[PDB]
Coordinates of all heavy atoms in Angstrom, one line a residue:
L108 N 4.9 4.1 4.5 CA 3.8 3.2 4.9 C 4.1 2.3 6.0 O 3.2 1.8 6.8 CB 3.2 2.5 3.7 CG 2.5 3.4 2.7 CD1 1.9 2.5 1.6 CD2 1.3 4.1 3.4
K109 N 5.4 1.9 6.2 CA 5.8 1.0 7.2 C 5.7 1.8 8.6 O 5.4 1.2 9.6 CB 7.3 0.6 7.0 CG 7.9 -0.3 8.0 CD 9.3 -0.7 7.7 CE 10.0 -1.5 8.7 NZ 10.2 -0.7 10.0
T110 N 5.8 3.1 8.5 CA 5.7 3.9 9.7 C 4.3 3.9 10.2 O 4.0 4.0 11.4 CB 6.0 5.4 9.3 OG1 7.4 5.6 9.3 CG2 5.4 6.4 10.4
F111 N 3.3 3.6 9.3 CA 1.9 3.5 9.7 C 1.4 2.0 9.8 O 0.2 1.8 9.7 CB 1.1 4.3 8.7 CG 1.4 5.7 8.7 CD1 2.4 6.3 8.0 CD2 0.6 6.6 9.6 CE1 2.7 7.7 8.1 CE2 0.9 7.9 9.7 CZ 1.9 8.5 9.0
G112 N 2.4 1.1 9.9 CA 2.0 -0.3 10.0 C 1.8 -1.2 8.8 O 1.7 -2.5 9.0
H113 N 1.8 -0.7 7.6 CA 1.7 -1.6 6.4 C 3.0 -2.1 5.8 O 3.7 -1.4 5.2 CB 0.9 -0.8 5.4 CG -0.4 -0.2 5.9 ND1 -0.3 1.0 6.6 CD2 -1.7 -0.5 5.7 CE1 -1.6 1.4 6.9 NE2 -2.4 0.5 6.4
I114 N 3.2 -3.4 6.0 CA 4.4 -4.1 5.4 C 3.7 -5.2 4.6 O 3.5 -6.3 5.1 CB 5.4 -4.7 6.5 CG1 4.7 -5.7 7.3 CG2 5.9 -3.6 7.3 CD1 5.6 -6.5 8.3
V115 N 3.5 -4.9 3.3 CA 2.8 -5.9 2.5 C 3.6 -6.5 1.3 O 4.5 -5.9 0.8 CB 1.5 -5.3 1.9 CG1 0.6 -4.9 3.0 CG2 1.8 -4.2 0.9
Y116 N 3.2 -7.7 0.9 CA 3.8 -8.4 -0.2 C 2.8 -9.5 -0.6 O 2.6 -10.5 0.1 CB 5.1 -9.1 0.3 CG 5.8 -9.8 -0.8 CD1 6.7 -9.2 -1.6 CD2 5.6 -11.2 -1.1 CE1 7.4 -9.8 -2.7 CE2 6.2 -11.8 -2.1 CZ 7.1 -11.2 -3.0 OH 7.6 -11.8 -4.0
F117 N 2.2 -9.2 -1.8 CA 1.2 -10.1 -2.3 C 1.8 -11.0 -3.4 O 1.1 -11.9 -3.9 CB 0.0 -9.4 -2.9 CG -0.5 -8.2 -2.0 CD1 -1.1 -7.1 -2.6 CD2 -0.5 -8.3 -0.6 CE1 -1.6 -6.1 -1.9 CE2 -1.1 -7.3 0.1 CZ -1.6 -6.2 -0.5
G118 N 3.0 -10.7 -3.9 CA 3.6 -11.5 -4.9 C 3.2 -10.9 -6.3 O 3.5 -11.6 -7.3
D119 N 2.7 -9.7 -6.3 CA 2.3 -9.0 -7.5 C 2.5 -7.5 -7.3 O 1.8 -6.9 -6.5 CB 0.8 -9.3 -7.9 CG 0.4 -8.7 -9.1 OD1 0.5 -7.4 -9.3 OD2 -0.1 -9.4 -10.0
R120 N 3.5 -6.9 -8.0 CA 3.8 -5.5 -7.8 C 2.6 -4.6 -8.1 O 2.4 -3.6 -7.4 CB 5.0 -5.2 -8.7 CG 5.4 -3.7 -8.5 CD 5.8 -3.4 -7.1 NE 7.1 -3.9 -6.8 CZ 8.2 -3.3 -7.2 NH1 8.1 -2.3 -8.1 NH2 9.4 -3.8 -6.9
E121 N 1.9 -4.8 -9.2 CA 0.8 -4.0 -9.6 C -0.3 -3.9 -8.5 O -0.8 -2.8 -8.2 CB 0.1 -4.5 -10.9 CG -0.8 -3.5 -11.5 CD -1.7 -4.0 -12.6 OE1 -1.8 -5.3 -12.7 OE2 -2.3 -3.2 -13.3
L122 N -0.6 -5.0 -7.9 CA -1.6 -5.1 -6.8 C -1.1 -4.5 -5.5 O -1.9 -3.9 -4.8 CB -2.1 -6.6 -6.6 CG -2.9 -7.3 -7.7 CD1 -2.9 -8.8 -7.4 CD2 -4.3 -6.7 -7.8
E123 N 0.2 -4.7 -5.3 CA 0.8 -4.1 -4.0 C 0.7 -2.6 -4.2 O 0.4 -1.9 -3.2 CB 2.2 -4.5 -3.9 CG 2.4 -5.9 -3.1 CD 3.7 -6.6 -3.6 OE1 4.7 -5.9 -3.9 OE2 3.7 -7.8 -3.7
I124 N 1.0 -2.1 -5.4 CA 1.0 -0.6 -5.6 C -0.4 -0.1 -5.5 O -0.6 1.0 -4.9 CB 1.5 -0.3 -7.0 CG1 3.0 -0.4 -7.0 CG2 1.1 1.1 -7.4 CD1 3.6 -0.3 -8.4
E125 N -1.4 -0.8 -6.0 CA -2.8 -0.3 -5.9 C -3.2 -0.2 -4.4 O -3.9 0.7 -4.0 CB -3.7 -1.2 -6.7 CG -3.2 -1.5 -8.1 CD -4.2 -2.3 -9.0 OE1 -4.9 -3.1 -8.4 OE2 -4.2 -2.0 -10.2
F126 N -2.8 -1.2 -3.7 CA -3.1 -1.3 -2.2 C -2.5 -0.1 -1.6 O -3.1 0.7 -0.9 CB -2.5 -2.5 -1.6 CG -2.8 -2.7 -0.1 CD1 -4.1 -3.0 0.3 CD2 -1.8 -2.4 0.8 CE1 -4.4 -3.1 1.7 CE2 -2.1 -2.4 2.2 CZ -3.4 -2.8 2.7
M127 N -1.2 0.1 -1.8 CA -0.4 1.2 -1.3 C -1.0 2.6 -1.6 O -1.1 3.4 -0.7 CB 1.1 1.1 -1.8 CG 1.9 0.0 -1.1 SD 3.4 -0.5 -1.9 CE 4.5 0.8 -1.4
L128 N -1.5 2.7 -2.8 CA -2.2 4.0 -3.2 C -3.5 4.2 -2.4 O -3.8 5.3 -2.0 CB -2.5 4.0 -4.7 CG -1.3 4.3 -5.7 CD1 -1.7 4.0 -7.2 CD2 -0.9 5.7 -5.5
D129 N -4.2 3.1 -2.1 CA -5.4 3.2 -1.3 C -5.1 3.7 0.1 O -5.7 4.6 0.7 CB -6.2 1.9 -1.2 CG -6.7 1.4 -2.5 OD1 -7.3 2.2 -3.3 OD2 -6.6 0.2 -2.8
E130 N -4.0 3.1 0.6 CA -3.6 3.4 2.0 C -3.1 4.8 2.1 O -3.3 5.5 3.1 CB -2.4 2.4 2.4 CG -2.9 1.0 2.5 CD -4.2 0.9 3.3 OE1 -4.2 1.3 4.5 OE2 -5.2 0.3 2.7
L131 N -2.4 5.3 1.1 CA -1.8 6.7 1.1 C -3.0 7.7 1.1 O -2.9 8.7 1.8 CB -0.9 6.9 -0.1 CG 0.5 6.3 0.0 CD1 1.2 6.4 -1.4 CD2 1.3 7.0 1.1
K132 N -4.0 7.4 0.3 CA -5.1 8.2 0.1 C -5.9 8.3 1.5 O -6.4 9.3 1.9 CB -6.0 7.7 -1.0 CG -7.3 8.5 -1.3 CD -8.1 7.7 -2.4 CE -9.4 8.3 -2.6 NZ -10.2 7.4 -3.5
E133 N -6.0 7.1 2.1 CA -6.7 7.1 3.4 C -6.0 7.9 4.5 O -6.6 8.6 5.2 CB -6.9 5.6 3.9 CG -7.9 4.8 3.2 CD -9.3 5.1 3.8 OE1 -9.7 6.2 3.8 OE2 -10.0 4.1 4.2
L134 N -4.7 7.7 4.5 CA -3.8 8.5 5.4 C -4.0 10.0 5.2 O -4.2 10.7 6.1 CB -2.4 8.1 5.2 CG -1.9 6.8 5.8 CD1 -0.4 6.6 5.4 CD2 -2.0 6.8 7.3
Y135 N -4.0 10.4 3.9 CA -4.2 11.8 3.6 C -5.6 12.3 4.0 O -5.7 13.3 4.6 CB -3.9 12.1 2.2 CG -4.1 13.5 1.8 CD1 -3.6 14.6 2.5 CD2 -4.9 13.9 0.7 CE1 -3.8 15.9 2.2 CE2 -5.2 15.2 0.3 CZ -4.6 16.2 1.1 OH -4.8 17.5 0.7

């Protein structure tokens, strides 16, 4: 995801993962 510009840290792993999953789905 860093390759596509997303370097995130919200201070909550569960929420970061959910974000990451949305981003992966959008990319696909």
Side-chain angles (χ1 to χ4, degrees):
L108 288 180
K109 179 178 174 294
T110 281
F111 294 86
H113 312 76
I114 62 171
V115 303
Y116 181 87
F117 315 147
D119 181 304
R120 181 61 78 70
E121 195 194 11
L122 291 167
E123 274 150 37
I124 284 172
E125 311 190 326
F126 180 76
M127 288 164 78
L128 280 172
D129 294 316
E130 296 313 301
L131 283 170
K132 182 183 169 188
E133 283 279 56
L134 283 177
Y135 177 50

